[PDB]
């Protein structure tokens with residue numbers, strides 16, 4: 001079919017969403033596209049190339065809160081940004097796995113510069129701003145990852161009997177599985193943001 | 208070679224550390240063990256079985272701070288536990304990927320019950336205790352994941368030119384790569400723990 005960047009990415013993203021990160025192989029991508037492998041190799045040289053581009057395009061399509069509103073608090077911005085990041089990562093199977101270990105792409109430079117600049121404008125050093133942004137990303141990535149993988153592990157094998165569970169775990173597990181991970185994520189998110197605040201506002205005060 | 212659980216796990220863990228989660232295939236495990244595939248299948252039925260058992264055994268070997276010291280603060284316990292979790296996950300390649308989406312194993316029940324109980328003894332509801340423990344796990348998993356995958360992505364392809372970078376990103380990237388991720392992790396960890404505290408101690412007070 002069509003082999004421009006957009007369509008290769010389209011198809012890869014579909015393939016990723018079907019079969020996960022394990023099924024995103026250049027052989028299987030060729031089959032989806034209805035092409036031979038040397039044809040695909042002209043456009044895509046290897047899996048890592050593809051993963052990097054999927055990471056970028058997942059956010060370009062589905063990460064709608066990359067930048068703060070006018071006069072937005074840094075706390076509101078991080079909260080909205082994280083929610084948005086999470087939603088984007090959850091949109092495709094292994095979406096979070098695809099992002100891991102990437103660094104911002106040239107197409108993301110202005111955006112991520114603005115984010116970094118905004119944190120500094122709000123009282124953070126670059127370093128402390130970056131630590132906050134990293135922490136929010138990492139927390140969100142792990143939350144999504146554990147959600148997405150747990151759901152995949154369910155399809156493979158079942159959990160063991162309820163019968164053997166000690167009571168707080170048994171209850172913990174019901175809570176965990178009472179939603180998709182969203183409640184615990186939002187709660188963790190506010191914790192995290194408030195700790196940044198405690199840190200920012202302490203300035204030199206031992207805190 | 209020997210095909211008891213311990214030795215299958217030994218060899219899988221070696222295989223995982225060599226070739227990562229992609230190379231942990233029952234075919235390649237058979238080759239490492241020097242056995243035929245039907246021989247291996249008797250002991251290990253599929254990849255997910257193996258992943259679950261590796262998740263458990265990684266912590267059994269290398270997660271040394273699972274339980275609080277006598278009279279330890281919950282804040283100290285989370286900090287020490289997280290450090291310990293991180294160290295365990297970083298010990299093997301894709302160690303964090305292996306953990307994702309698991310739930311506690313029967314062999315971990317007493318431990319994780321004690322952890323849950325301890326948080327409740329320290330003022331948390333089960334639910335808020337679990338949200339704190341989840342948040343600490345997720346943050347730590349994402350931190351480790353992004354560290355481990357970034358290092359793998361380096362071996363594949365290089366970062367693009369420094370030349371095009373806007374200045375705060377350029378600086379951010381040096382900071383990020385000034386250590387293995389540890390400084391940012393520890394900083395994020397204290398933020399997170401202090402936000403739990405703010406939340407715990409607020410009780411009913413709007414906070």
Ligand SMILES: C[C@H]1c2cccc(O)c2C(=O)C2=C(O)[C@]3(O)C(=O)C(C(N)=O)=C(O)[C@@H](N(C)C)[C@@H]3[C@@H](O)[C@@H]21
Pocket residue numbers: 059063065066081082085102103104108111112115116133136137376379380383
């Ligand atoms: C500042 C970026 C950065 C800087 C240095 C090293 C890095 O690895 C990064 C990132 O990876 C970032 C992202 O991935 C973003 O998700 C990122 O690229 C992104 C975006 N394109 O809008 C975000 O919304 C960010 N958000 C907190 C989840 C986040 C970035 O802020 C950083």
Ligand SMILES: C[C@H]1c2cccc(O)c2C(=O)C2=C(O)[C@]3(O)C(=O)C(C(N)=O)=C(O)[C@@H](N(C)C)[C@@H]3[C@@H](O)[C@@H]21
Pocket residue numbers: 169172173176266270272273288289292309310311315318319322323340343344
């Ligand atoms: C309470 C456990 C739990 C409860 C309900 C659903 C879950 O998925 C879990 C976990 O997955 C936990 C872990 O993985 C631990 O890492 C876990 O199993 C573990 C351990 N074996 O010592 C830890 O140190 C924990 N730590 C915060 C990283 C953590 C556990 O507390 C939880």
Ligand SMILES: [Cl-]
Pocket residue numbers: 001002003004
């Ligand atoms: Cl074309």
Ligand SMILES: [Cl-]
Pocket residue numbers: 071072073076
């Ligand atoms: Cl605001």
Ligand SMILES: [Cl-]
Pocket residue numbers: 208209210211
């Ligand atoms: Cl044997």
Ligand SMILES: [Cl-]
Pocket residue numbers: 278279280283
């Ligand atoms: Cl203490």
Ligand SMILES: [Mg+2]
Pocket residue numbers: 099102103104137
């Ligand atoms: Mg990133």
Ligand SMILES: [Mg+2]
Pocket residue numbers: 306309310311344
């Ligand atoms: Mg776990």
